[PDB]
Design a protein around this ligand. Structure first.
Ligand SMILES: CC[S@@+](CC[C@H](N)C(=O)O)C[C@H]1O[C@@H](n2cnc3c(N)ncnc32)[C@H](O)[C@@H]1O
Ligand SMILES: CC[S@@+](CC[C@H](N)C(=O)O)C[C@H]1O[C@@H](n2cnc3c(N)ncnc32)[C@H](O)[C@@H]1O
Ligand SMILES: CC[S@@+](CC[C@H](N)C(=O)O)C[C@H]1O[C@@H](n2cnc3c(N)ncnc32)[C@H](O)[C@@H]1O
Ligand SMILES: CC[S@@+](CC[C@H](N)C(=O)O)C[C@H]1O[C@@H](n2cnc3c(N)ncnc32)[C@H](O)[C@@H]1O
Ligand SMILES: [K+]
Ligand SMILES: [K+]
Ligand SMILES: [K+]
Ligand SMILES: [K+]
Ligand SMILES: [Mg+2]
Ligand SMILES: [Mg+2]
Ligand SMILES: [Mg+2]
Ligand SMILES: [Mg+2]
Ligand SMILES: [Mg+2]
Ligand SMILES: [Mg+2]
Ligand SMILES: [Mg+2]
Ligand SMILES: [Mg+2]
Lengths: 380, 380, 380, 380
């Protein structure tokens, strides 16, 4: 009856997450001036370099140097001794207008409600009753361990901490009629960039006492729990200097930590016409509405689109046997209650608001104060 | 009892797939000279630009200009009229050595069998008895539609075709005791870059008669099947000019098309010490061995690692109720029969051989002549 | 009594000259919207790449992709078969604001007439009565040979010509009391990029009959004149693909072809507060005013500046013995008649007008319709 | 009888000079392994970025990251607080092979002595008896002021100094039968990058007492000498962050500070087949041999070449009336005594030795221990 499941998360200074945050800072900067900006901004990070590459058509006047450098400052990379500095890094820009062939097929001369999907693709939403926020415990804990590191770095409790971090949590679960019940934490991994001066034993002691014990309820930890803390032994070189970063290379950290499924599309740097984002957000909204509405305990929702077509091509519901209603019955409830055209999702979820930089670390789901996390009351 | 599932694939000239192929061309070039090369090569593509960024420590002498340009030539981008040309594009290189802090924690002064995982992470393998190659029909068909386009482009049957393409296939399935049985094709999408001179009606006629009807068995197509062929209406601008590409932004196309699960790690540009690749390949091998061995009809396998630790932290088996044996029983069979340390996987699957460029389009799984696709005979 | 002197020139598609033209296209684009734009734009060209690097503080909204690509189109690089294409090349931008430390020292809170020099430096102007335009015959002929090539390329007379070209002219002169008198052309070199299909003998025949004989008066050519036409034997690979280009690497071609002197400063990509440009233009104006005013036959003028100081630090006149007046007397005439503060030069020479792209090939001096080429009437 | 002349120099951390030093570090790195390396390496510097662009064909295996970063370390940019750091800056490489069309025209299948010039162009050498090193006093003093700043920076006397500096020296001269005699220093400018903490009055006091008075003989300074010390008032932002740098943008600082003449060609990043360097070095050698041989007091030498042709196209001697021999007589002495083919100059001046990084700051001429500064004994 029991099994293991593992999820990971990364910190705000992880090189891939730096790129996601920058891409969404750029998106927000455009939306502040032009709510209808078309944005597809990829970021690449390596030693001393932020490169912006992609397509933007917008009426906004954006200072890319300022936006990029302020985002990196916020993350905490402000000195060459940390391996990266917002004041002195290179910022290169290779941005062009959106292809007119895409524009004519997707949104030119179309009513906002009837805007075509900005691309083809598939997307999944997922929800589980195992936590109040309707997310897997494995990823919730992984995120919280990274957030605790940032907190202790920023308040001076552990001044040897740097911004680049990774965590991983293995939980032992019991099966419960298709739902899952967390029993204990089996293994925790933490790797975090650090200054030259602190030794390994001090780091491992702090990671156990001030990070893990501050985040994970004691009821989940026991004599058998395995700890891999600074398992490489040394992590002075970090950030983009240690490892190249790219936008959209943490798509499982951004979503459900391996639970449910993923259709492949990245979120960050994209406006609402890119269904990779808007439709994945709507699918989460559907999944969370089904669980918080008491129709099931655990659920996966698939949707798909074709470029230039407003309505989804397919919708599917998988409830793992956790509902008295059939999956067909749930599908019909979803069809009666949701309009999954991108031009309607934008209204329902306020997707022209410049709130995207907030989403780009610690996961897009199970977080405070987003429209896709507020359940819709269902009629049936 | 029936449901829809959708998967996509992309062609060799899709900008993300260009980057995956280049990253693996670079990997292969190093492995040809130095079997123990440590490679973490990211590629970025935009109008007129290939950028290499990442970390390589190798004894090989590699001409990056030649490797990159030959890969782009193979894909078919050989003239400015197509939007990209291997002869005249910019190739920029920002490659450094692997971090010594990583090297000391992972492989320096370690026995090959006892090499630590090159990073933390989670990985999944999947197999399904619905096709002989043990892959989902949705993605098999999607891949084959892109390969047919490349074939007809290269043999001059449809000389208006360009290298950038995307396909998407929705299949109606029936449930069968946890396994899945394909009934019909519900919807097909094809978008492909084209020359200025061909009209939309000629393209849509050719896409139906010479591509779809040449790939999809007639038994799956009927009067109700939906066709979205060149749904944007125009796709002259394409390749990196139309849309920026990055390595590792097609991870679901590379694997199972939404079926099973994904741990988040990209494959291309990485040597065998990066468990994102080696352990995902081994997990496929386990999944396919369980199905071809008659122990189940459909199966998902999770594994996870910590950086610097050779043995996996967790292993999990999910059989969807398609075995007479318990999941615990299958886990014990897997533990008795496989050694999932990266330093052993490398031997079993010949992962120092320069065969990776072959994997970087049309999916890494269900393909001819790879060691991870040859089942292991199981003792129990 | 006789001696040789040699000067060179390059065509509009020479890689260095591509960069000068782009830098001045960017300058003009800013000046069209903001006459007080502070611009220091460097351009770099290599295979498939235009990079903009430098400092701009301006109220203008400039589309750098459009400006760069239109400039390259004008030059004639419009197909991958020519080695470079404005439609498909990479354009990268690394532009920041002008340093506030420079701004505060040079122009903030200063009256326009009393603006400080934007940098330290030295500059020279030169004029010679040997041609009506008051320029050395060697460089006048070199420029005209490149312009003839562009003409015959653009009108289809020699359709095998490509935009990248270089010329060089050696003239035998006689001394005449410090002035110089051209006697004959001693040697001509022409190298020009060409298509694969034309042979060397056809090219050399055309270069003699349709280019040289169309430009150089027959009185200068004789049986002893030496011709080095396509002396490398093959020049198919050309433009940035053959040789990297940078802004400000043709400063002698831009000025006097080795005659007179040079202080080292580049012209292109710089607004009027950069005395490298404004003061060199004023010094030409002084030199040409002295010669056209009948005060001398040949003259060199030096000026110099310190950053943040409005008046020149030094002014010097060298007349080669070609005046009845002393050099001291000429210096006093120049001091009475010219105000060489950058904030006054800007008024006199209309240096906020967007006419700089015009200057960036075929030399900045001896050209039609520039204020620095119209003599000032001198009082003394 | 008296006149002013002004020359400038820049420090090792001036952004243009950073690029020259890097380009020559790369050249030296290749020559250490392959004496016949063909090198044309341009460097570009901006905030956080070193870009290498150009053409190299060589048997050497060069680590461009190491070479670039070590050069920047030597200069003194080792912390983000100084505006640039060798440890954390971006290094990008866009290097290709030399064009085969150039190679076939210049050196393939040719005897070393009969190698063609690597390009067309003109070059000048100059010498003056006004100093023992046969250089203009104006530029000698300007160089020495920058070297003094570097000395006091590096020994901790003035720890507020940073690596980016510029100087300028105006000397009052008397005419002496075509030669020039220095009388006094008229004006000195010094601008140097500095830390936030030092005030302007302390800087100006130190610049006068510890720099100027330590370099310039007191006999040249008097009550009328003008001092412009930190004339901008503030220079905290500096190096590539303050101003973009490029290779070959200090060609007058590299040579004669405005005296004599310049043909336009840059020196740094080029092997001996590029006559811009080898022939300019030989022309200096000729000029210095004429002066040290007692044939004249001041002399200018022009040479020119065509690509693919070994012998110069023209040679000219201008002695300013400082010889009893005619210029024709001096030309014939030069022709009898020198062989100015690049394949002979290489032997005479040891131009395959990796000593070029040494030349790339403080001028290429008048410096200790170079073959072009050792006079040839002349037969006539
Ligand atoms: C796995 C190291 S790196 C990925 C592999 C690397 N591209 C290579 O060249 O081998 C991925 C992430 O892991 C973290 N990291 C970096 N250095 C260390 C280190 N010395 N120890 C532990 N973790 C580290 C950072 O987040 C980094 O982005
Ligand atoms: C969805 C177009 S693009 C992704 C959106 C784009 N970044 C934007 O700026 O809007 C993704 C892929 O879709 C394909 N594509 C490109 N142009 C067209 C087009 N005009 N019609 C249909 N498909 C197209 C290519 O594979 C391309 O990489
Ligand atoms: C001297 C060739 S290149 C400068 C040298 C080059 N960097 C190298 O790597 O050897 C300078 C210029 O010369 C012209 N050029 C280019 N190819 C040829 C050629 N094959 N024959 C004659 N001239 C040529 C172009 O203007 C070019 O910018
Ligand atoms: C003239 C400043 S800059 C050239 C102009 C600049 N591109 C602009 O955007 O206005 C040239 C050189 O001058 C020195 N410099 C930089 N900042 C200052 C400053 N604040 N005061 C004095 N000199 C300075 C450095 O060597 C620099 O490369
Ligand atoms: K990476
Ligand atoms: K993209
Ligand atoms: K060059
Ligand atoms: K500059
Ligand atoms: Mg990554
Ligand atoms: Mg997608
Ligand atoms: Mg993509
Ligand atoms: Mg990973
Ligand atoms: Mg050049
Ligand atoms: Mg200057
Ligand atoms: Mg400069
Ligand atoms: Mg030259």
């Amino acid at each position: 009856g029991t099994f293991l499941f593992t999820s990971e998360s990364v910190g705000e200074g992880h090189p891939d997450k730096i790129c996601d945050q920058i891409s969404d800072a750029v998106l927000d900067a455009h939306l502040q001036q032009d709510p209808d900006a078309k944005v597809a901004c990829e970021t690449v990070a390596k030693t001393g370099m932020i490169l912006l590459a992609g397509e933007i058509t917008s009426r906004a006047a954006v200072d890319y140097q300022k936006v990029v450098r302020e985002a990196v400052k916020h993350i905490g990379y402000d000195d060459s001794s940390k391996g990266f500095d917002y004041k002195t890094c290179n910022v290169l820009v290779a941005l062009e207008q959106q292809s007119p062939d895409i524009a004519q097929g997707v949104h030119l001369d179309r009513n906002e409600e009837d805007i075509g999907a900005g691309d083809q693709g598939l997307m999944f939403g997922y929800a589980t009753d195992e936590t109040e926020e309707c997310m897997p415990l494995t990823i919730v804990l992984a995120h919280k361990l990274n957030a605790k590191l940032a907190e202790l770095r920023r308040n001076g409790t552990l001044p040897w901490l740097r911004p680049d971090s990774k965590t991983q949590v293995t939980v032992q679960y019991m099966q419960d009629r298709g739902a899952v019940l967390p029993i204990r934490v089996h293994t925790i991994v933490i790797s975090v960039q650090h200054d030259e001066e602190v030794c390994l034993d001090e780091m491992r002691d702090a990671l156990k006492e001030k990070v893990i014990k501050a985040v994970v309820p004691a009821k989940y930890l026991d004599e058998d729990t395995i700890y891999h803390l600074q398992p490489s032994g040394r992590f002075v070189i970090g950030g983009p200097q240690g490892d190249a970063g790219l936008t959209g290379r943490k798509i499982i950290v951004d979503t459900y930590g391996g639970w449910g499924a993923h259709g492949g599309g990245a979120f960050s740097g994209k406006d609402y016409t890119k269904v990779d984002r808007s439709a994945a957000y709507a699918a989460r909204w559907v999944a969370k509405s089904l669980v918080k509405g008491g129709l099931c305990r655990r659920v996966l929702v698939q949707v798909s689109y074709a470029i230039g077509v407003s309505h989804p091509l397919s919708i599917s519901i998988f409830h793992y046997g956790t509902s008295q209603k059939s999956e067909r019955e749930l599908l019909e409830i979803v069809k009666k209650n949701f309009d999954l055209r991108p031009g309607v999702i934008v209204r329902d979820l306020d997707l022209k608001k410049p709130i995207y930089q907030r989403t780009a670390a610690y996961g897009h789901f199970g977080r405070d104060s987003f429209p896709w996390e507020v359940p819709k009351k269902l009629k049936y």
